[PDB]
Design a protein around this ligand. Structure first.
Ligand SMILES: O=C(O)c1c(O)cc(-c2ccc(Cl)cc2)cc1NS(=O)(=O)c1ccc(-c2ccccc2)cc1
Ligand SMILES: [Cl-]
Lengths: 233, 237
């Protein structure tokens, strides 16, 4: 019986989590930091212990993981950062609010995007204020032309998340290490989907809470032995 | 030059405030030590430094210094490797005692010997020591061979267990082109500085590295310093 914990970062700055933050490396707001502190406290109260930590390369996630580790006094744990856990890449929508998206592209198209699993938003073009910021960012310089996305469908995000899960995270769990994952809504979606074998429509319907420990209890083949349980009051 | 290496030594801890012996006790920074790290990182920033990998102990005063630096420079994404081999020197049974308690229990002679010596360890930390479970039983050294877990350390011991990590794990990455940043402790950094500079036991013991100040090394292809360490920061500091 293995124990796996997910945490999803809370609010980022400038209201960006309602502006398709995506691959833009927004920091937490003071609120989102607070949220992460609460998740840490929860974990501390419950006496949890971990042996390895996995996170994305985006600082809203990393800073949540740091807050948690501090709260529970395991700042000495090994930490592995992978872009494969990055937030979904929203391409040209990244930065816009709901109204600006509708203005730019129309409510029919937005609805189609909001409802599709396989259909990407329009790519981030050079005239986008985040194009160089993200695509020429030092931290992705090792990614081949095909790996570095200009935009992703939920299918795409999950596709590039799972290979890291399988190849890195699964081995450690099998070796009995107690994993903690701090990441973002859509990458955690992909993990959960492969876990609970959910349908496309089902996963699009799932919306994981922020800054809250999500506890999974697993059997010897990594299937959950019961539904996901949360942590707090 | 070919390569660039940067070290940083963490600053004031909670127990420095109490002037207790920390060693492998996992004390946090004081507010002032944290602020120090913020200044170290603001310096690194102003200079424009970039890194590819970072190294540090498994003691939170190093780790938090590292974190603070990475925040100030906007490289929180970097890979980070933690190792006990970078830990502060283990002070054995002196752990938790302050200057007064050390002197009262051991006398001027003994403490002077321990201070001015390179390979005389302090007393072992025995199982009845108030911090023995706290440290020796801490689950973070579980993968340690019985011969690796010190009860106490000379400065020699400390360097002896530090240098294996340097040689085997940091050197490769430097020669790979990876700009390294090391966040650790006075004595482990002493070991690294000693190797880099070929210093005598005398000179190394006389050397006292500043806290929270980036220490830069410019290195040729053989990891030989090409000039004396530099301190980063505004003119005064
Ligand atoms: O320079 C000094 O360190 C010193 C000294 O040489 C002599 C006296 C002294 C005067 C009067 C009386 Cl009655 C008793 C002792 C006090 C001193 N300072 S100390 O803070 O206590 C201290 C002593 C030893 C270590 C030490 C331990 C283990 C490994 C390495 C270093 C660290 C701090
Ligand atoms: Cl880290």
């Amino acid at each position: 019986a293995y124990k796996l914990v997910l945490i999803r970062h809370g609010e980022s700055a400038w209201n960006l989590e309602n502006r398709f933050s995506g691959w833009y490396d927004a920091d937490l707001s003071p609120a989102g930091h607070e949220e992460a502190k609460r998740g840490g406290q929860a974990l501390r109260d419950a006496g949890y212990e971990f042996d390895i930590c996995f996170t994305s390369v985006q600082k809203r996630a990393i800073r949540t993981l740091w807050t948690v580790l501090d709260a529970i006094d395991q700042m000495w744990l090994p930490v592995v950062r992978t872009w494969r856990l990055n937030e979904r890449h929203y391409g040209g929508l990244t930065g816009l609010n709901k109204a600006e998206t509708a203005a730019k592209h129309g409510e029919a198209q937005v609805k189609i995007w909001r409802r599709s699993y396989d259909v990407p938003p329009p790519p981030m073009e050079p005239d986008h204020p985040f194009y160089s910021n993200i695509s020429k960012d030092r931290r992705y310089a090792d990614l081949t032309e095909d790996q570095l996305p200009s935009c992703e469908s939920l299918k795409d995000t999950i596709a590039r998340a799972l290979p890291f899960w399988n190849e890195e995270i699964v081995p450690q769990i099998k070796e009995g290490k107690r994993v903690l994952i701090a990441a973002h809504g859509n990458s955690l979606r992909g993990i959960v989907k492969h876990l609970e074998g959910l349908s496309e429509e089902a996963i699009m319907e799932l919306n994981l809470p922020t800054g809250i420990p999500i506890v999974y209890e697993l059997d010897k083949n990594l299937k959950p032995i019961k539904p996901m349980q949360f942590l707090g009051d």
